[PDB]
Amino acid sequence: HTLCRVHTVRTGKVFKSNIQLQGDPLFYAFPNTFVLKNVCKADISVYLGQKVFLTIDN
Amino acid sequence: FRFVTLTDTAKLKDFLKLPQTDTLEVMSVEYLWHPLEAAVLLSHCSVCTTNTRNIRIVIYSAIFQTWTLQDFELQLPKEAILEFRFLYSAMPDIIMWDQ
């Protein structure tokens, strides 16, 4: 409401697709979360935290 | 007004990876602002035998002859009759009304 307004992004779940996770997920060693941006291509980024997310999209 | 069948619900079931024997119907079809594309609206509940029905949109592109599923999550009672319009935009933004 004040400052920013929330909205959630959620795609590909329109039908009950069931793809199980392969391997062991990575986790950032430090308690705090961080977002590391590729300097040249703004879209590519890595969210480091409890789980690691590398997004070609923003 | 000579024409040939575009598609049918059986091929849509095959494409959408649906387990077949489900209830799939076409509520409506509309040309979107793209000159060579058209969106088809489908009602599906997977042999639910329940009033609720998931509503989906699949866009057919005549350039590529390709069907693509779209992120549409709406759920309606089965009794509803749906009509939708595409707005004046490059992106597919729609307005539906169920009476």
Curated annotation (Swiss-Prot), chain A:
Phenotype of the disrupted gene, per the record: Mice are normal but males are sterile. Male sterility is due to defects in sperm cell hyperactivation and decreased stability of Catsper1.
Official protein name in the record: Cation channel sperm-associated auxiliary subunit delta
Subunit (UniProt): Component of the CatSper complex or CatSpermasome composed of the core pore-forming members CATSPER1, CATSPER2, CATSPER3 and CATSPER4 as well as auxiliary members CATSPERB, CATSPERG2, CATSPERD, CATSPERE, CATSPERZ, C2CD6/CATSPERT, SLCO6C1, TMEM249, TMEM262 and EFCAB9. HSPA1 may be an additional auxiliary complex member. The core complex members CATSPER1, CATSPER2, CATSPER3 and CATSPER4 form a heterotetrameric channel.
Localization: Cell projection, Cilium, Flagellum membrane
Tissue: Testis-specific.
Coiled-coil region: none
Function: Auxiliary component of the CatSper complex, a complex involved in sperm cell hyperactivation. Sperm cell hyperactivation is needed for sperm motility which is essential late in the preparation of sperm for fertilization. Required for CATSPER1 stability before intraflagellar transport and/or incorporation of the CatSper complex channel into the flagellar membrane.
Species the sequence originates in: Mus musculus (Mouse)
Family: Belongs to the CATSPERD family.
From Swiss-Prot, chain B:
Record-given protein name: Cation channel sperm-associated auxiliary subunit epsilon
Expression sites (tissue/organ): Testis-specific.
GN (gene name): Catspere
Oligomeric and partner information: Component of the CatSper complex or CatSpermasome composed of the core pore-forming members CATSPER1, CATSPER2, CATSPER3 and CATSPER4 as well as auxiliary members CATSPERB, CATSPERG2, CATSPERD, CATSPERE, CATSPERZ, C2CD6/CATSPERT, SLCO6C1, TMEM249, TMEM262 and EFCAB9. HSPA1 may be an additional auxiliary complex member. The core complex members CATSPER1, CATSPER2, CATSPER3 and CATSPER4 form a heterotetrameric channel.
Compartment(s) where it occurs, according to its Swiss-Prot or TrEMBL record: Cell projection, Cilium, Flagellum membrane
Disulfide bonds: 45-48
Stretch of the intact protein here: 395 to 493 of 985
UniProt record similarity statement: Belongs to the CATSPERD family.
Domain of life: Eukaryota
Functional description taken from the UniProt entry: Auxiliary component of the CatSper complex, a complex involved in sperm cell hyperactivation. Sperm cell hyperactivation is needed for sperm motility which is essential late in the preparation of sperm for fertilization.
